[PDB]
């Protein structure tokens, strides 16, 4: 029981998608555990990856996992988890949870711009 092709070039089929997804989800938890608790991105990522990890651990079949997650095929789930792992590695250094780095200049976001007011 294996998929013949994904119908989508550049991504071959995965031999063990469940362990790859679980390892990427554990690495996302390890990257997000260094974030401060007051940051909303940590809570949102923890809720997402906990729901996805429960979906992976609850379902042993591949197409049942793809239906239960509902996002897409499981190789694209691996791609999404890798992208969110790269994001969770980067946002520790980008430091998003603080205040505004630059205040709003005067008449910067006014449309139409030529008025006296």
């Amino acid at each position: 029981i294996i998929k013949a092709s994904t119908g989508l070039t550049g991504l071959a089929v995965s031999t063990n998608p469940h362990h790859t997804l679980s390892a990427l989800y554990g690495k996302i938890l390890r990257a997000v555990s260094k974030m401060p608790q007051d940051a909303s991105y940590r809570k949102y990522t923890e809720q997402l990856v906990k729901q996805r990890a429960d979906s992976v651990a609850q379902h042993k079949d591949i197409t049942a996992l793809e239906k239960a997650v509902g996002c897409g095929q499981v190789e694209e789930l691996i791609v999404q988890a890798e992208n969110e792992l790269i994001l969770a590695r980067k946002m520790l250094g980008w430091k998003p949870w603080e205040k505004l780095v630059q205040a709003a200049p005067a008449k910067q976001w006014d449309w139409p711009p030529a008025q006296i007011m």
């Binding site: 590695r89 008025q115 006296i116």
Partner: protein, 151 residues
Amino acid sequence: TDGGPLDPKTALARPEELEQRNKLSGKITVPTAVNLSPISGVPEEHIRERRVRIHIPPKNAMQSGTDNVNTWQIEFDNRERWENPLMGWASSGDPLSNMNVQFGSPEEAITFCERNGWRWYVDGAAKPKKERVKNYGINFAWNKRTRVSTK
């Protein structure tokens, strides 16, 4: 931090490269008066010869609307136009004669002209509003010269 794989172009870089990236990520102190004439690509003759007028545009006297008055604008000095000898059109060698640039306040246009290095001048300031009283009872008055003879 994270216990994953480190970035190889930051760990293996020399200390001079780490100092070079951190200095460009900072903020330098510059004067706010910046001349950008060699950057804008304008020829130098138009820089030293043209005069720029900052003005509020004139209201059309045949029309009561003032929506087109509500902005300031930059316009350039009118050079020579001529008639081409073939067919009779209005040829012009002035590339900047057709450009009106809209602005909100004369201070913004003055700072823009100081940025681009133009020789600027303001034709007139903002028009003050005079309080004029208008009501219908003045038209029909007793021992007054303002009694209207129409209607």
